[model samples]
Target: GKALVIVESPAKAKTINKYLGSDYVVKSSVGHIRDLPTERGALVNRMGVDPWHNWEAHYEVLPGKEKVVSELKQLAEKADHIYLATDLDREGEAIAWHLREVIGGDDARYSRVVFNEITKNAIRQAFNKPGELNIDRVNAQQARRFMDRVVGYMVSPLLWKKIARGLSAGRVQSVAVRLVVEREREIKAFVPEEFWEVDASTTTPSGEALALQVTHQNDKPFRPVNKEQTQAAVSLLEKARYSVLEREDKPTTSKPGAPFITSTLQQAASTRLGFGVKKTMMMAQRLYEAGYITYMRTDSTNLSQDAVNMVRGYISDNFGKKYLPESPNQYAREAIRPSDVNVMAESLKDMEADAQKLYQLIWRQFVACQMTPAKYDSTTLTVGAGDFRLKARGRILRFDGWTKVMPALEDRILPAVNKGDALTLVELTPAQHFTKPPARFSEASLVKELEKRGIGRPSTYASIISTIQDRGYVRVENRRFYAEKMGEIVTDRLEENFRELMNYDFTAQMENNLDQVANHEAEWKAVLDHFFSDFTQQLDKAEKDPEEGGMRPNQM
Candidate 1:
């Protein structure tokens, strides 16, 4: 009998099957076949976790997936062995666990296989080294799913009762909405302050024009704050003779950025291609399923030795010996990159525009990381007029190095000038400016902020951003988030009533606890029990006091 290998998507199955002989039959589950019941009464029965009843949960085969599960079960029954090759994440672990439960296979008849990329060699190697299903990872996924269900079931009803119909809350998504709302409020309340900058364009006696900005007055750092101050400085400069006071030149080196991790990849996609967070992940998923790159969702910066060596060889052969790094960049998760350099992004055919752009960015970033640092010649010139002094700076590229892959350096050549050299002022210019409040979150910046605060996982960032917008809690205007009125009202109530759930640190702490569960250091049930004890109490209090619970005063 042939062995049966199960993966999550047909695209992945097709790629994997190509690497395996007829002894292995590959199939796709098409995602989860079982989930918590969605029917209202059935949800309570089947969402079915009882904190007091030993934290038991009810799971059922999801509708429309019965055929997929049946087909998989039949295939499992016919196979000599079963290999669970779903994703390598917690959610993927849970899927494999559920599939095994329904397929009725003995421990000896089944095993789990993991691989980061879909290349033929990787697939064959993963099959040779079969392992056991990780129960700890499955439990962690269950804990998150259970906690989110509990939070949504409790809070969403209250939102409908107080604000409007069909509004919902999430453990992570609600916090995201609150952040957007608070930022909007801050912008509305802000008052801009006025300030000024004075710049002088001067020409050296050697006949080259240079730009300088005021830096100091009376030997202290200075910035003119008004028209009067700027005008006074202009009057002084018009009458005073200008001479070079100091000159310095030095060399500087700029190291290339590390290769793309999940969060950074999403941010770069948003910044460079103007793709939204959801769109970026969707295209990355396609790339992964097609075996064009390594795993797309990872936080680790560790590039594998094989990948590094491959990149180095490709660079030395194509670019030059000078471009290869003397030593590899050290780091633990595989950085996103083409599975092989032979499968260059430029040579790939039939790819969507968004995918082509993202592939190019990943390609350049990975290549640059393994190349030498860029070098520059930096020059600083200081000039004096009475007590007012100004400084001018310039940079010229000494070596392109890594920047040869993606150029970002600018060249500013300064005129030949020496200390004590006299110069004539072109003009004195002053411009008024105002201080601005913090800008609203763009998709890229929001992902970065969430990553900084430890609010969500790399796997969840895209969905967290998209869910808030889909629920009408927020909307993107001019590529920035704007919290809707309903979003503000719901967030206010949740903040006042479910204080702990809304705290940024509290949510981050919950994620840490989940990590502990995945690492086998903590029990998933104990963590949930501890959380729900206080959560239920707050739910009761909010239900009892609608006004104190979170209804706006005017509405009440």
Candidate 2:
């Protein structure tokens, strides 16, 4: 008897194919095999979904994928068993569910297997514990897709009639664009206030030079809002002799962040690796398929007990017992981690460089999550002049601990000094500056905001970001988001009309509703029904006064 294993990506199929016996044949769906009407088509509804008819939807075999579905059906006929081994998330569940539907046979033949990583043990273990497809999870994915489809199909035409022909808007992407547009307005509406800073370089008894800032005048606030105020303060500071008013040292610890979830991974990749959110997920997916790291799209920060024990063992072996925390850390029901603790990036041969970099990031974070917090000795030195109080701060790393895996901040050490010790002053430096406005969101910051607001899930974060850019609503410059005129106009129109849809709480609430559907607490169709009822109301209102608060096609 032979088994047929179907995965979403060919690369994933290739890796899992090697793990199973020769008797098992592996195939790839590449991606979704079908989708709702992508454009105006001969369907009962323009969007391929009949909202009035209980949100019933019609999916066409995705163009160019008829053969893929046909081939899988042929294999399903001959196979003794069929395993739907796609990703282990809602979207993945949806894929496996769809594959089962397309294969269409004795339901007994089709089973589902899930694994976070593509390692030999994990893959084989999932097969050993094969189970039925999770329809609840599949329905959750359906609810999300249908909601997005309805919004995109229905509201997009309003954009086309008012703005440009290709303009489109998504429920989530509309919110994302609004966030950017709101920030842009803040930047434009900002009124910058002029300010000045005074600084001096001083020496300790041991002739150790320290850069310090004047924080107070006469023990009160020392804020100088203009050049004249700063100059007067600078003149007084230049004439007065400097002496240490107080010196304090305190111990501190830096605990490592919980292991990388999808959002944090994207944030770190953007800030540290200079990778865009989309590229980060792409590389992570590659690393995951190649058996280098665990599932890249996850919200849980908890690790498997087995993974905890392995990380502890590695820490005890490499950094000694002191580095290991007395109690193992538990974050995530599962987090992004290397499949094998011993498989360092440097040890890997014949790999894509980006995947290697991403793996190293995932590996370090996973290990650091279980290690003891880094210890530090912090010092604050206050210098007293005639009427000005200047201070300098220092932080010295006392113990590396988790910092051994995650790099620690640079150590700043103050010269050995005591209170009342006189110090030599170099010169008072005065600098002029202006108040700054809020920064435009970078990919990392935007993802963080979305996660904070609970607007998008682990899998949808990257796609939502990509969708906004793809629709030309927003543009990226120097890795930061800037709303285009069309972006602002579209968001403005939706804001005036679809108040509930544009609200943060409402968007996040939709996520909670989807979670409820996944947890079997609510019928997914009902969720769509309730949503469409309200959304249809919005549609009618917007349609009635189409010109109100809308940009004419000629406005742009």
Candidate 3:
């Protein structure tokens, strides 16, 4: 006599039951009920012997889930209404759509309810504003599956002919692989610049003495690029006297960065926290599924008022007024897309407590940003040695604000010194240093590079980076990204042939378009059609080109 609600997992069902009370029954699906056939039998037969494509694809029910399906059928037979409460994202939407088709027969007993997080308000709101299953989102996910299948299952065999055994590539995977390869190229080709600097120690009219480095005309420290230049400057600076130029002290504030987008989280974890992309995403995923945060795959840095309120309260209560900002601080990075920010903000204002945890994580990051730029007071002592000008510089931090939260970050602290004091030269230190090859990329740096080039989504970044490393296309050496010989060969071959698909904009646009499809703004089939057409052309060219396709001999 009451409505029955079906969700993806038992843990979620348990959480929802506590919030919804009686008069509703909640159940679990435990994931997908259907998938393309996995029996090594082709899901589709090629239209011709050419094996170009198998347009007619097959969908089979998951092999081991007949019992679960049967149980669900028994429960649904007597229920007057059915509500599908799966995930709110595209993949989740598709699962719900499929379940509805399978369970809701000639007699209509089906509806859809979506919630961003599991909590009282979120559940109630979802049921109150029940909507139809979204075919758009489902199809969008299908489109991505289709692309992977076509590229991996259909085209990867081509690699065996050109390169070695067991090496394969995909649309997004190959491009990421290329990035690792390109970074290695940059490292090998790098040349270091040589430079030097001059500092003078002198006493002013005051009771103390200090040193300052020679700064450019605007009081900016300019290091001499070489020993020769330093010697030349030292020879000239044998007769001049120094003077107090200028001093400046100001209070500055840094705004909090947006909440962790998937890509950003990976980058930050790699750069700031030293976590690998895989490990970071795994932790975030646990955080996401446990209802400790909102969707971890999103690019939007949105937060709910409740989530904000929770974190703000936590900070005020636990961190004290010293750490709290006078007002809420919100900042988007220079590279954040307008759409991404808008989407994130809309979602942030409406999250449940489970989702609030992620907000808290982001809130900590944001508050730290807005608290204050790590405070530093700088002192400079200028002196004219001979005709050449030299100076010494020092700086010290006044307080540790955000640095407290971001403990890993190095803070600036200048040693104390007086304005007018004279000191003997502590052995004119002349040292030699080699300019390093551009440092091999770390996974985090590689992710940043991908983001800059618009290669992949925040959600996809961790997996993308890990896939290549796992495949041995890239090797980690001393915390730097280096492409192995095999990786370089594959990437070079792909770039040589499929210039259009491998370019930065093309890869990023593909990711963006996939997002659009997930949001129901674009047709999934259309996206596939566009990609397939481009790929076809590229394949033709690579085949016909006189130079041929495949990795160079030495690269392998």
Candidate 4:
């Protein structure tokens, strides 16, 4: 009997199956065969202050996959060994645990393998040193599952009573929706101050034309608060003789931004390619499966030494030594709070089989980031028009640094100018513009906002985005995020009745605390204990009063 390896998809399995030999029989589970059902939410046995998760009530084999599960079981009977090679993240770990339970094994017969990218080197390295499933990752996944069950099953029915049968709100998604709603309110109430400026078309001796405008005594920029004030300035400047006041040059250096993470990738894709979150994730998934990139779902910027070396060589060979950095650059990680940019020594320290796979992914992205910096030089000129002041600024690119490797995923354009050069007045155009309302959130921006507020995980971002879209909570237009009418209604209801519970800071902190528990820095029960105490009180009060459950709010 040969060793059997089970993965989540046939496409993924095909990649690995080709990489592994006859000794390894690769197959697909087609994602989770079993999950919590929709008929009843899972029950929790609160034990010793810890919220105990009992998944039996809701967990079931995924619909239409019963026979596949049966076939896998039959195959397991004859296989000498079994390996669960699903995804590498927490979800993957959970799948491995589930597979083991169904395969009927002593833990010894079942092993776990992970490859960040389906590269042959990564796949072979993974099999050379397969390991047991990580319980910590499983526990993390379990905690998230429990959280989802508690929120979805508990809250959706309540929503049905108040709103409609299909209406739902997620623990994190609702919070994000509320933020947009609140921002919308602020924008509606906002009154912009009317402001204006005057530009002078004064010329130099020898017919050298130069354009200047009113400034604060040639030291600071000036803006007239009213049209009357702007007209007064223009009248005065019309009679004033312009003269050079001061010239200054400031030296500066611009660093390239860190490599793309899940949040950044979505943002970059939106900005550069006008791709939406779902499309971006889909493209990234294909890239990962094709071995073109590693898992595009991480927040860590840590690059492995081997990956670093490989990238450096790729750069030197493709570009030249002048384009190379003198030494490998490490990003500065903020120490006070848990920042995703920080590279722990352990992140690149001793490489485990799985870590190596993840490392390869990081290496690919990081070297691409370090190829060169996007360089620009700026010049600001100050001049005085008699009783008025003005300034002109221009910029030029000295070199295209790291940008050479990745190309311009960001937008920029240089102004045509030179030092001590005479300039022509470009029509002194005066166009009126109103203060714009606040912009709706983009998918990338939403993820960034969530992470900054501590509401979601990098791993959960893609799914969180997917769930909200699937549930009709929010709609995406031109790769931008906007809360739908249904989303705003539920968000308003939750925010009104459960103000304290819906506080984003509190939610983000809760996520961090959950992460801490998973890391063993804090006990899971202890975290649940404190949270449930306050939440239970709120629930009781909510039930007794019912708090306008059927009411709807105004729309945008």
Candidate 5:
């Protein structure tokens, strides 16, 4: 009898098939085969999710996925044993659960397998330890889907009625737009403050020129308020004698950055490779499907022991044991990384340019995470001029540990100086500047802000960014997000009526609730119950209230 293994993508199926024998067959579901119905009926249509009626959701096979579903069913029926080997996450669990329901087979013969990477060893180990489908994770995905549907399908019509046709709102995307809208307002309202700094050009005992920053005025901290004050300070320092007051040298260590989770990878790629969030995830998906990296959507920082050992061994043999850690640092999810370090980026051929760049970044970051810290010698110097004091600082590299792969810092080693040494004054200069306004959100910083605020999870960041832009809630001009006129109007109205939904804390709390469902700490329906009850009341109140911007459709 034949055994069947199902995965989400054709690329992954091909790779896994090479590892399994002739008796075992692998197939791809080609992504989700089922989703919430798009029609307008009570069972599973636009009104399908009845929150008051047990939060019931009606699902239908996606329009073009019927053929795929038919084939999967045929395969499952003929196989003696079946395994759902989808990606290991809430979304993947939901996909597998949907497949299980649609592709009915004997429950005893069905099992679920999950692995971080597509390596033979990882796959074998996972198959050997097959577990039952995690209902908690499935329910978590369900709750999120239903909540989003309730907000999107129901509230979006309100947007259409109030503002214009083709306008839409989302539970999370609206809040993201609000962040940009609020930030733009802050920038517009900002008042620039003037400030100045004084720098002293002095000569060392050996006649070497040195630049030190003015640290004090009359034994108190100094910050010149205007160009006139800076000129006055320069006049005093021009003829004053300079002497070294104190010198100190300290050792500093820079620990390596934690390995890439989804959000970090998106931020880094956006900043480093100039790839947008969607493009980055798309490239990462290709790398993952090609078996070049582990699952790209995880939030955990843990690495498998074998992966850790492989990286450690590579570091010891290639760079020397000094670069290797005394003991491996442990984490909950394996870092996003290449399957094998020996496969260098330069050697990868016949791939898209961006994919290769992203793969190399992942490879370097993973190896660096296991290496020792970069060490530096930091030097500080304090110079005295009568009652005023100035300081100079510099850093010298002692060891480039992990920085060999990911370099940080530049060498600006200071010259040797001792206390009580006489110095020659060369020149004094003062510079005037104004404080900058708050910066607009770039895709990188926006994702960082969202993650910091706990507004969304690893898998949802890219979509949250793309969705807001797609709906015209925000626009990206020169890679920075700016609120559109439509965005401002919609956000202001939402703030006036549905302030609770726009509340940052409210959205974050709901995200936390979804996590609880995934962790099996709360029933999914109860979580929805707690949110929809209050949400319905808000909707009702907003519906009855007069339109704030005037000229309703009926009045017009």
Candidate 6:
């Protein structure tokens, strides 16, 4: 009889099957087996959790996944052994657990196999060292699932009743919406301050271009606040004798950043390619399933020993010796990179253009992660002009090491001029500027913010951003978020009502609690009890009045 291996997708299942012996058969779950069934009775069951019955969840095979579950069960019953080869995450742990429960057979029938990179070598190693299920990890995943269902079921209904029907919310998504809403409010309430800058362009004796900016006025840091002041300064600066005060030349080096974490990947994609976080996640999943890279959803910045060796060799052979570092970036669990460093974006004939574009980013970052620093020869020249001190800076790329794979900035060369050399002012241009209000959250910056505040994890990062837009709470224009009126209203209501849930630190703390549960240090049930106990109290009060319950005064 053949042993069975169950993975998340047929794409991965096909690849993993190749790495196994004839005695092994690979199957795909297509994701999760069954979520809490939707709409059981009176809508309370719609949430799938029986909160009254000690949070017991009712599960039903998802609408189109019944066949997958049944097939897995049938295979489970007769297998040499059932190897639960899901992803190496809590979500994956729960999927394997769900597979076990659905099969419901001899305890000895199932074992777990975990691997980050889906390659023949990696797969064989993981299979050789098959392990048992981590019940704690499954419990942590379930705790997260149960809490989200409770909040989604409870708060969303209140939204329909108080604001508008069909409105939806979640614990994490609500906080995300609040972040965008608060930013919008801040933008609206902002006051712009007028300011000006005085720039002097001149030429050195050897015909070198020199652009200087006034850094001080009357020997104090200069920032003219109005045209009246700027005009006066510009007039004086135009007539003032300018001479080179000092010249400082130095060499600077910039090393490559650690390979992409999920947050950073989404941010870089959004910033560099103008791709939305959701779109970026889509491309990344494709890359992962195709075995072009390791797991896409991870916060860890670790690269395996094999990855380091392969990348180092590739860099030495292709990018030259100078670019190859002495050792891999001391980054820690295999960070996202190509499964094979030999595969370049240009050579990927099967994937789409966007996938290739994203692959290039990953490929470069992975290779550059083991490369040497970029070197630059830097120069800063200060010009003394009456009471104003003006400065000009220049940088020339001396060595493009890791940046050959990634990117380096353009070179700005300043003419050779020693201290005490007199210079003629080419032109004095005073530009009027206004202080900008803080920028609205773009998908990239928002992901960066979410990661910084610890409000969302790698898996949830994309969805948290997309959900708010999907629920009509927010919209993106020119790649920046704008809170809709209903979004503002809902956030305002939640801010008043669900203060704890909306608190950035509190939501982040909930994530930490889940981590502790996964590590077996905290009981899953107790964590839920503590959350729901306080959660229900707020839900009850909000369910009971108008102003105190978070209804807008005018609407009531």
lDDT of 5: 0.86
Q: Scored by CA lDDT, what does every candidate get? A: 0.86, 0.86, 0.64, 0.65, 0.86, 0.87
lDDT of 3 by residue, 259-372 (tens): 566777677667755678787666555444455455566666665555556555656765677766777555431111111211232354434543333344444564454454
Shift in Å, residue 478, candidate 6? 0.6
TM-scores for every predicted model: 0.96, 0.93, 0.81, 0.82, 0.95, 0.96
Model 1 per-residue lDDT tens digits across residues 261-330: 9999999999888999888888888888888888888998888888999889988988898887788877
Misplaced by over 4 Å in model 1 are: 39-43, 407-409, 546-556
Candidate 6 structure lDDT: 0.87
True-structure lDDT of candidate 4: 0.65
What does candidate 6's lDDT look like per residue over 64-178, in tens digits? 8988888888887678899999889899899888888888888788899988888889988998999999999999999999999889878888888878888888989999998
Task: Note the clash tally of each candidate.
Answer: 1, 5, 41, 11, 3, 4
User: Which residue ranges in model 6 land beyond 4 Å of their true spot?
Assistant: 39-44, 407-409, 547-550, 553-556
Cα-based RMSD of candidate 3 = 6.2
**Model 6, residue 67: C-alpha shift (Å):** 3.2
1 or 4, greater by TM-score: 1
Per-residue lDDT of candidate 4, residues 1-556 (tens digit): 9989998887788767778888888889988887655422223422111243423233567788888888898888889999888888787888888888766868888889876667667788888899888886777677666665566656676677667788776777677777666665676778776667666564554554556655664345577677776666666665665555555555444666666677776666666556666767675665455445667667766555555566677678777886688776665311011112233214543334433333333343465465656466666676665555677665566776765644344323223333444433333433344566677677778877777877767677777777877888777777566767777778777776566668978888778777776677776555655666666555545544344343332323
The global Cα lDDT (0 to 1) of model 1 is 0.86
lDDT score, candidate 4, position 519: 77
